[PDB]
Design an enzyme around this catalytic site. Structure first.
Site, short mmCIF file in Angstrom:
data_model
loop_
_atom_site.label_atom_id
_atom_site.label_comp_id
_atom_site.label_asym_id
_atom_site.label_seq_id
_atom_site.Cartn_x
_atom_site.Cartn_y
_atom_site.Cartn_z
N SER A 1 -47.70 -40.50 -55.78
CA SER A 1 -47.03 -39.24 -56.05
C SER A 1 -46.75 -38.74 -55.02
O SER A 1 -47.63 -38.53 -54.19
CB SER A 1 -47.56 -38.39 -57.25
OG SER A 1 -47.89 -39.18 -58.45
N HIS B 1 -46.58 -31.40 -58.89
CA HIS B 1 -47.65 -31.68 -59.69
C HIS B 1 -48.88 -32.22 -58.66
O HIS B 1 -49.98 -32.40 -59.40
CB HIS B 1 -47.46 -32.90 -60.73
CG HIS B 1 -47.30 -34.20 -60.28
ND1 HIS B 1 -46.15 -35.04 -59.88
CD2 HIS B 1 -48.32 -35.19 -60.05
CE1 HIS B 1 -46.48 -36.09 -59.58
NE2 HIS B 1 -47.93 -36.24 -59.83
N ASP C 1 -39.97 -31.24 -60.24
CA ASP C 1 -41.32 -31.50 -59.83
C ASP C 1 -41.22 -31.50 -58.32
O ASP C 1 -41.07 -32.61 -57.76
CB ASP C 1 -41.68 -32.83 -60.26
CG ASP C 1 -43.08 -33.10 -60.02
OD1 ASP C 1 -44.01 -32.59 -59.45
OD2 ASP C 1 -43.53 -34.50 -60.22
#
Ligand code: PRL
Lengths: 26, 249, 10
Positions: free
Chosen positions: B197, B43, B99
């Site tokens: 992230s 992502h 992910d």
């Protein structure tokens, strides 16, 4: 092969400031 | 990172910074797994709901960093990307399932005191260490609150039982995720936040004393909110895919 | 906010 062993810590047998917290949780 | 502390120099030599070329900005964290390969969250690169679709030429990988904003002259190494591989079954439509993404560097970086790869877990390391209550470590240059650190931050967080992970959210949790963080009653706090992230969730094996990356910072609902937890991509469950792409070329 | 990086990287 040499993975996961930090030049400035494991390789010189020095421990970082909080790694004991991790080992103590195992 | 919320409620973490300044990392020591060389504490996380596999920490990678995903850096946008124009405008110059921190996109995400990432990790070095060999001299040529970087592991991050899919992502960070591909997320259609927000018109995010970065290609190799949009990004730079910065390795060996400590300061977030400073160009660390004879310390950090900046690399260009050759190819980005996103898991074919990455589910951006629903819950960020699978992910994960791999990035091949244009050329190998030389290891140093500040640049060193982390290990990927094997079946038994994953089995022994991925247990509720065991603490892992998250690092990143992300926001300090739901403002930005000057130096790499670090926080140690306990893995949480699957039932409580699933009961803290309306989102459908899969076997390719695990959640981590302190429960409201436990008194201690800490969580990843925006900018973190793609970064590594690592654990140190008490058997051989090596650091292994068990997870990738994937998603959360807010940052360090009571009764909420950070979710991580389960690296071992997707290792077959990882090996496949590094084997292919 | 980030310090300028060497142009050979861009
Ligand atoms: N545990 C985590 C992991 C990733 C996260 C990503 C975020 C992105 C935007 C935002 N507003 C909050 C976020 N919080 C996170 C918390």
């Amino acid at each position: 092969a040499d993975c996961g062993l930090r030049p400035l810590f494991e390789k010189k047998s020095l421990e970082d400031k909080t790694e004991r917290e991790l080992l103590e949780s195992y | 990172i919320v409620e973490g502390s300044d990392a020591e120099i060389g504490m996380s030599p596999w920490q990678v910074m995903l850096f946008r070329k124009s405008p110059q900005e921190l996109l995400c964290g990432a990790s070095l797994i060999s001299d040529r390969w970087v592991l991050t969250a899919a992502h960070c690169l591909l997320y259609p709901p927000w018109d995010k679709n970065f290609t190799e030429n949009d990004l730079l990988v910065r390795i060996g960093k400590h300061s977030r904003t400073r160009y660390e002259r004879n310390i950090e190494k900046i690399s260009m990307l050759e190819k980005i591989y996103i898991h074919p079954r990455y589910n951006w439509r629903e819950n960020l399932d699978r992910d994960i993404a791999l990035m091949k560097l244009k050329k190998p970086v030389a290891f140093s005191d500040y640049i060193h790869p982390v290990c990927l877990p094997d079946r038994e390391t994953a089995a022994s260490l991925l247990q509720a209550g065991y603490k892992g470590r998250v690092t990143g240059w992300g926001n300090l609150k739901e403002g930005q650190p000057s130096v790499l931050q670090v926080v140690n967080l306990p893995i949480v039982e699957r039932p409580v992970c699933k009961d803290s959210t309306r989102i459908r949790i899969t076997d390719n995720m695990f959640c981590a963080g302190y429960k409201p009653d436990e008194g201690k706090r800490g969580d990843a936040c925006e900018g973190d992230s793609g970064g590594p969730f690592v654990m140190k094996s008490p058997f051989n004393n090596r650091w292994y990356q068990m997870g990738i910072v994937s998603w959360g609902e807010g940052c360090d909110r009571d009764g909420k937890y950070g979710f991580y991509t389960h690296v071992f469950r997707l290792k077959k895919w990882i090996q496949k792409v590094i084997d292919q070329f | 906010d980030f310090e300028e990086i060497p142009e050979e990287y861009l």
